[PDB]
């Protein structure tokens, strides 16, 4: 149907916008601390601590499968990256502080993205 095609076009343009957001968020992590899943070989007890691991590569895989239906779903995953890190790592670590900085800088990007999704009407 034309309606299904129209909805698929909406999802595709949402995906385009979220790809830009993801690229902007990742630019705020030049250390690439959050680029890949935390290695279960290098951190064997990680899953005892963190029940839902997340990272930018995993997000990007979901993104390209058009697996984010709305911005809230995308934001949930971004929050997991930050929140997991601030639980597993202590306050005085380069890891924790990198999450804080990514959170603070990412908030600007997500604030305008919310307005754009609402304005253009993508969900
Ligand atoms: C974000 N993040 C963590 O929380 N841990 C424990 C990590 C370990 C490595 N090796 C790389 C990134 C990491």
What is the number of beta strands? 0
Q: Give the CA-CA distance, first to last residue.
A: 19 Å
The string of secondary-structure elements, in order, is HHHHH
Top CATH class: Mainly Alpha
**CATH homologous superfamily - what is it?**
Bromodomain-like
PDB class: gene regulation
Keywords: SGC - Diamond I04-1 fragment screening, bromodomain, epigenetics, XChemExplorer, gene regulation
Assembly: monomeric
Entry title: PanDDA analysis group deposition -- Crystal Structure of BRD1 in complex with E13683b
Give structural notes.
Helix content is 68%, strand content 0%. It has a single domain (1-123), classed as Histone Acetyltransferase, Chain A (Up-down Bundle), CATH 1.20.920. It has five helices and no strands. The relative contact order is 0.17. It is elongated. The PDB classes it as gene regulation. The entry lists the keywords PanDDA, SGC - Diamond I04-1 fragment screening, bromodomain, epigenetics, XChemExplorer, gene regulation. The assembly is monomeric.
Structure summarized in a few sentences:
The chain has 123 residues and is mainly α. It has 5 helices and no strands. Helix 1 packs antiparallel against helix 3 and helix 1 runs antiparallel to helix 5.
